[PDB]
Design a protein around this ligand. Structure first.
Ligand code: CUR
Ligand code: CUR
Ligand code: NA
Ligand code: NA
Lengths: 117, 117, 117, 117
């Protein structure tokens, strides 16, 4: 809830993207992706509570957003299988991460908002 | 053609946005918007030939893209009346400007690529 | 605070865009733009309290975001003079409007999130 | 060339993103990512010639754009390790795919333009 938040918006309907599956992975020493956390976006398009300060150590993380299932639910043919946002988490003050995604059937945009309390 | 080019893409269909009206204005000495050029995008989503090197002097220009008529023709009631850029041109000498717009019913993005001849 | 909110993000620094001037206009019967509301974004990149339910009637509105002054404050040369988000406000249930903008020096993206309480 | 093209733009400088590494993978029968093609963007920010009509069969493809090396070379420490698309190709017969990426240090967007030959 504190260190890693995801927010997803729908650019076709001008709304939060609701009930979107989100999977978070951390890169392991053997360079495979290890499941870390997951959830579904809320009615406000948000997913909180994925991890804790103590669990969210420096490392390379992947946030996969299942955009294809979302567009299929709406009856709209999409391009992407999903979105895959990959980043290194870096200590340097008590940083929080918000991964924002804006979805269209044939385009997505993702931004990171990195702040301090 | 070369000095000012517009490209418009549809993020719902993954296609050029074809036959989109584009109106260009230039700010006059009395701080009003004067008509400068207009046209429609081609089957490739592009609009060339709006102006010339001789005509495209220093100034503040506004490019208004009629996105609402575009979406309405496809059965969609969009949020915005139009997409735009407003920019100062040729401040440090002539440049070539490509204005790219990416359209969704409730979102748009406008990007400039500026090249030195 | 309720019916019209603006949120601005900085894609270069991964942060809220703070102290950005925002001006809202409503189109008048003579097709000129009449000042309606204005403010600066907060430390969270947000601007609330622009209008009230009673004041925010159907009409055509323009939200201008002074992006050029923001980039100038950061010492970064920008393309746009500002962003100009123009839309019709439409009754049909108790709708709220959030105008979100994502800023880069040579590109901006704007989305509308339109919801009900 | 014709079947799969990549274009990369820099939203900080308003320019093509030049000499950006691009790696393409194809999902194999055993659900692993197999190397398919790679290259670097030209002075126009474009990468052509990755594959052919004969080689580019139905499949799930991943295009990984090395945006982190790009930003680092310009003195910028960016948020993301790379930009990507993952997509199913040629499901309803051969198509021509242009993958466009627009880059900022803490944000990227990937758009597909899909044309029927
Ligand atoms: C104060 O800073 C923060 C802001 C936010 C954002 C909240 C929010 O409601 C977001 C928004 O309203 C929209 C964000 C946005 C805008 C344009 C885009 O292209 C996009 O996708 C890449 C997303 C989330 C967490 C924060 O810490
Ligand atoms: C001529 O029309 C076509 C264009 C293209 C592809 C690319 C092209 O010229 C695009 C461009 O020159 C600009 C593309 C663009 C615009 C906005 C963005 O946010 C973005 O990044 C996600 C990219 C592909 C097929 C076409 O038929
Ligand atoms: Na000059
Ligand atoms: Na087929």
């Amino acid at each position: 809830k504190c260190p890693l938040m995801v927010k997803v918006l729908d650019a076709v309907r001008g709304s939060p993207a609701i009930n979107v599956a989100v999977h978070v992975f951390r890169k392991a020493a053997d360079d495979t992706w290890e499941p870390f956390a997951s959830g579904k976006t809320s009615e406000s398009g948000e997913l909180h509570g994925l991890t804790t300060e103590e669990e969210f150590v420096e490392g390379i993380y992947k946030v996969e957003i299942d955009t294809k299932s979302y567009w299929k639910a709406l009856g709209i043919s999409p391009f992407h299988e999903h979105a895959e946002v990959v980043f290194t988490a870096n200590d340097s003050g008590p940083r929080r991460y918000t991964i924002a995604a804006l979805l269209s059937p044939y385009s997505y945009s993702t931004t990171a908002v990195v702040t301090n309390p």
